[PDB]
Amino acid sequence: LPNITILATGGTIAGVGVENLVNAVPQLKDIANVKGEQVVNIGSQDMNDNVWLTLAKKINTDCDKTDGFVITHGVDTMEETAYFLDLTVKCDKPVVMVGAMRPSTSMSADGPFNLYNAVVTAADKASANRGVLVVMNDTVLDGRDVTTTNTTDVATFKSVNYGPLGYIHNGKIDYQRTPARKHTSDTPFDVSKLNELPKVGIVYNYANASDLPAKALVDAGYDGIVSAGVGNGNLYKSVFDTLATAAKTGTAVVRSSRVPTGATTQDAEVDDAKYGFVASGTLNPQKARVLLQLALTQTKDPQQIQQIFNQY
Amino acid sequence: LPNITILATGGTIAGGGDSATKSNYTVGKVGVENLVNAVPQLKDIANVKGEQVVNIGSQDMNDNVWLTLAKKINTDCDKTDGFVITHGVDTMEETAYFLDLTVKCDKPVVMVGAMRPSTSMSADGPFNLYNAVVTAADKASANRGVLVVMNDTVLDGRDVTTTNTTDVATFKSVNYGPLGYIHNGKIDYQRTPARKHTSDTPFDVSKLNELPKVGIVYNYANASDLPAKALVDAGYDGIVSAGVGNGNLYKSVFDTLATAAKTGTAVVRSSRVPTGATTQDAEVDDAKYGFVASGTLNPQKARVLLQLALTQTKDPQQIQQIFNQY
Amino acid sequence: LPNITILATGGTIAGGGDSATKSNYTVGKVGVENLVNAVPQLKDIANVKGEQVVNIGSQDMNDNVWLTLAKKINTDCDKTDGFVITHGVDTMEETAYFLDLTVKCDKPVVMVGAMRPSTSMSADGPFNLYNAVVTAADKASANRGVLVVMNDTVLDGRDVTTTNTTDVATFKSVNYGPLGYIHNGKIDYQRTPARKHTSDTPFDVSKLNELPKVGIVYNYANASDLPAKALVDAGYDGIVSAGVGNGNLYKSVFDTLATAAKTGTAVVRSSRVPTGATTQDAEVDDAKYGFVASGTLNPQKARVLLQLALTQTKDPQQIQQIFNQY
Amino acid sequence: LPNITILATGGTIAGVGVENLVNAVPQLKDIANVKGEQVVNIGSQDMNDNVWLTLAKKINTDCDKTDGFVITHGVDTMEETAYFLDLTVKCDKPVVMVGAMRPSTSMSADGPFNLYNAVVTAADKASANRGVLVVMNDTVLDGRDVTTTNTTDVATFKSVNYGPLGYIHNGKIDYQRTPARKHTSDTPFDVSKLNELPKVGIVYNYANASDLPAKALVDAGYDGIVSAGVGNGNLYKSVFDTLATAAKTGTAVVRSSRVPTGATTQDAEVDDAKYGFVASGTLNPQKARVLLQLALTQTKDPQQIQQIFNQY
Ligand SMILES: NC(=O)C[C@H](N)C(=O)O
Ligand SMILES: NC(=O)C[C@H](N)C(=O)O
Numbered sequence A, D: 001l002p003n004i005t006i007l008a009t010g011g012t013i014a015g016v017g018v019e020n021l022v023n024a025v026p027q028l029k030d031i032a033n034v035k036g037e038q039v040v041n042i043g044s045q046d047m048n049d050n051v052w053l054t055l056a057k058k059i060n061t062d063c064d065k066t067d068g069f070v071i072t073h074g075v076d077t078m079e080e081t082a083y084f085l086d087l088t089v090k091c092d093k094p095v096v097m098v099g100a101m102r103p104s105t106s107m108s109a110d111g112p113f114n115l116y117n118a119v120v121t122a123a124d125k126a127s128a129n130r131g132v133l134v135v136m137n138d139t140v141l142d143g144r145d146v147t148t149t150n151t152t153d154v155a156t157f158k159s160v161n162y163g164p165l166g167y168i169h170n171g172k173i174d175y176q177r178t179p180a181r182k183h184t185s186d187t188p189f190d191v192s193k194l195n196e197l198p199k200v201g202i203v204y205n206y207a208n209a210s211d212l213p214a215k216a217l218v219d220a221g222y223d224g225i226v227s228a229g230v231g232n233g234n235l236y237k238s239v240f241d242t243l244a245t246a247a248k249t250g251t252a253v254v255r256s257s258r259v260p261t262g263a264t265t266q267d268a269e270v271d272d273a274k275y276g277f278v279a280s281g282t283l284n285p286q287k288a289r290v291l292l293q294l295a296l297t298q299t300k301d302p303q304q305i306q307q308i309f310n311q312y
Numbered sequence B, C: 001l002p003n004i005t006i007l008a009t010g011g012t013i014a015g016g017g018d019s020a021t022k023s024n025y026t027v028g029k030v031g032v033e034n035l036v037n038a039v040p041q042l043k044d045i046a047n048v049k050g051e052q053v054v055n056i057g058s059q060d061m062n063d064n065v066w067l068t069l070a071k072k073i074n075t076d077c078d079k080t081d082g083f084v085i086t087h088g089v090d091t092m093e094e095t096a097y098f099l100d101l102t103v104k105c106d107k108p109v110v111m112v113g114a115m116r117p118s119t120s121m122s123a124d125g126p127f128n129l130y131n132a133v134v135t136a137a138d139k140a141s142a143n144r145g146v147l148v149v150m151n152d153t154v155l156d157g158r159d160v161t162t163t164n165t166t167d168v169a170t171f172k173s174v175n176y177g178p179l180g181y182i183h184n185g186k187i188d189y190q191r192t193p194a195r196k197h198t199s200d201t202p203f204d205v206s207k208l209n210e211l212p213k214v215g216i217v218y219n220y221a222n223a224s225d226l227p228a229k230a231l232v233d234a235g236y237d238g239i240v241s242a243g244v245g246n247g248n249l250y251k252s253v254f255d256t257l258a259t260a261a262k263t264g265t266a267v268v269r270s271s272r273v274p275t276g277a278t279t280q281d282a283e284v285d286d287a288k289y290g291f292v293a294s295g296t297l298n299p300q301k302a303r304v305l306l307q308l309a310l311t312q313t314k315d316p317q318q319i320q321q322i323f324n325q326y
């Protein structure tokens, strides 16, 4: 039976230490030797760069000691941690993230079977070499495209652009897809010696939007700003003016969208070359922030940033 | 054949590029007359009249165009049988809801856009506008609030949003579904919004020169509190949170918003999550902090309503009650 | 606390397997009392009473269970404040619509199922049933027709269907959306079905011992006409076509159905396509052949209505008019 | 510029010969040398085995004469032809199917740009080795999973289980996925010498369903029957009884579902080994019919049929 390490970070799946959780699902012993370590115990709305860094290091450092990783984490920023670990983890062994929408004590709590199926996925050899995974609602989702789609539904997690990698039925996975975008040990991002990441903020666009949020980030010397644009990554005029000024001033600018699916493209309404802006593609704003932070460890150059956004 | 007024505002529907097959295009360049004349069949369903109100990309929509549209619709109500408003897609969901809460005209107001410019191959704008006219002319379209018609579908202004960056099918009422489907110039209406709209709302914009100041702040891991603070220092009347999950906030964003709320800033919790209500009675004690839960309203839509709530009242429990009725 | 009657019929909600973590299970084995007692919190919201009506997999649902449910609900109307019906998922969409057209009780009838057996880990049945009771007890649930409650969502019997073979989230009203969302035992209703239901329909099953014979035939490339013919030779009163695309038929299926229609068999065009109306005025001249277009009704749902239409009339244009009002 | 062959079969995209169509889109000359041949001119509701066979042969025979194939076809059975060609085509060069929901003369007709983008996809070298494709509404969809989802919407075609392969913007495709299931020249199906296919019918399940359709197919000596089950491929009792009898009597039986997504699984309510039935997986009934017809050219054995359903 495979050796599987659970790294606990909190969330509503624990709404409680790694011990209790493991012990709540005695059927885990049917599929793996499960060992639990507590990294943190927080609601994922308070997820931060330091936790990210703790996790990337710990997985990379403990890779040879285990056959796989499950990370119990909150729902709220799961999609952001999944893609961070997707781009920084060097281990070629499965890393599977899982949470829950209802707590342990609620009617029809989703946590137990979620965990069961996260382990089935971490323990399956066919799960290797597909990047960092999220396993929720009987489904295996790549860490790049996965996002939460509904505020309360157990079925919230979806790969809303390119679809899931496979479905889990009766402790078995039929994989039919793997992400093409370069991930894990095919990426230049090496975070083993870093104690902090470049400062990247997100600003929202909408009608009559103020430029003040964007200005406060420029004023604070932020390394990057991600625009959550309207439509195909468009920007309200005040916001566009402030970011056209930040881009040439040592603040990288990534155009993403608040629209929940589809790529922000080049060649639409925004002359990106002319402003020194980067189009995020299908990366949603919080996702773009992950990749922007990590592109800034390698380079401050807009054109080389765009290339990274085109490859990872 | 009924009398329909097109109030044009721009958008990609009025967009042009130099090639039918390149994606590059510019917005707010083509006038209403060209739109009207690119749909030769409109004569069969209505006596159409265009007026260019502005000509912009909806990325640059703003309170003053809103005030201009509402007062214009309300003033001209008795000169026409219905309105179509051609408009960009990017903030269509915002304008549609603003109008849904402010038009007192009891004739259909139907917005419409296109995802491909008017120059492009298989441009979606021509049949979309045909279909917004059908809808505007249909007696059964009355008393449903303000509408958006795109891709053969009639959608209510409250729930409607854009779901994809390029897809002609982008416009969907993602929580409660469409009102009716359009086929052969006819509509099968199976729904009407329950929430109060139009002449059932207390909001009266007829003498308003401006709208209260409301900003939107985003939540994510390691979120800066600087955007929230910039809005607070500027004396904003309201702030909407685009929370994570069920309307949750990063600690530092939370702290800045709680303080603001004690000084009398209206603070609404919404969500960056694209479907589902930001609910009361979850991880935030709203009554403790003086916050308001947005319900199914996404952040840009909560802003519309919060701005309008702030013209009536500054009391958090009254703003809550408004966000439960409208 | 209101009085709620559970009428149990089986389903996976009443399903059991030998392991919590294997997928193998058997249906119609566990009685209503076990269901009720697996939701210890039901005492807080209603005085629940169970009656086992049958105990089957809904794969084996049939006209006689339909007639039994409708007459039972209609007879007992004044003994209770509402009904929950626990039922399999597989044909829930069919039973729900049959009831939606036949119940004359003006108290909520709410069906409910589960996608995992009651034995399984994180079984969905317990909270689903909790939530069908909330809904059945809610005054605002009245006058909406017959309902299905699953995965925190209240759905109308007409549009509701199962969209995935295993997903707990399978139940969706795919054309017109849900009626309301359930959170913390409360509902925000934003819609009601427009189509006529319950005490507004002419269908009266109270003295009926059986239902007219209606079969469903599938279309695909190279389709055999033998299924259509087997139904015609057996003297079926109606045949529903699960057409390709917008309700289109393979030539040989078409030919068999046209003939049947001239001899007085009712023939309804529906579609195997999972959303969108089978429309009039497309590639089939319905008036020419004496066929009826199903609208948004999928084939199994057109069957429900066709069977009921056939108790009133055999005239194709009257069957059309029924499929446009109900 | 690549050489691209358009094979015309009809449909509403031509609602008209291959000549007119090509000529309707003069911008085709920007991306390819386009040559058109007329195979048939029918509404795809009348698609049949003979057309399928004509197409598989013609593509396989003309492979070395061109750089790619676009097939203009009706919407109604596009998904069935795509998977047939997916499993029989031996050419390693792109085969792209396209149709339209509105005719040439309608407001905002979708045909012209649909065709434009089908050619962009047939002409792109990155499109090779992904199987038979369907390109509709700016999207590239694998032929196995693609299905029509709405009766009238231009956006009807979707890969509703595993998602699309890529999106087309400004004449370029960002591919992020490829089907894992074996296709084209990785399949044993060889149709070069066949003038007919095994007789396979489809029966529908629902409440109070008659066994007569199923019996009429057994009585006619059909090689296979596909059940469009309820839920996870369940069968009404009368239908179950008739098919339990056909399965041991020289009529292969495949359990599929009328439910528009998800796999029909083994290990649920139906003891498949015991009845000699095959679970279709994610193959919907009309799709299962394609694979069932072609599995019957190799074998009549239920257990070896199931294996093929597990691999292609
Ligand atoms: N269900 C959850 O996990 C929500 C919680 N706020 C978290 O993200 O930690
Ligand atoms: N499709 C569109 O109309 C997008 C455009 N930027 C607008 O909103 O004006």
Ligand SMILES: NC(=O)C[C@H](N)C(=O)O
Pocket: C010, C011, C012, C013, C027, C056, C057, C058, C059, C087, C088, C089, C090, C091, C113, C114, C115, C116, D231, D234, D269
């Ligand atoms: N999930 C379920 O309930 C499926 C079961 N076969 C039924 O419909 O009874």
Ligand SMILES: NC(=O)C[C@H](N)C(=O)O
Pocket: C245, C248, C283, D010, D011, D012, D013, D042, D043, D044, D045, D073, D074, D075, D076, D077, D099, D100, D101, D102
């Ligand atoms: N739009 C279409 O292509 C429908 C037509 N009946 C066909 O499949 O040939």
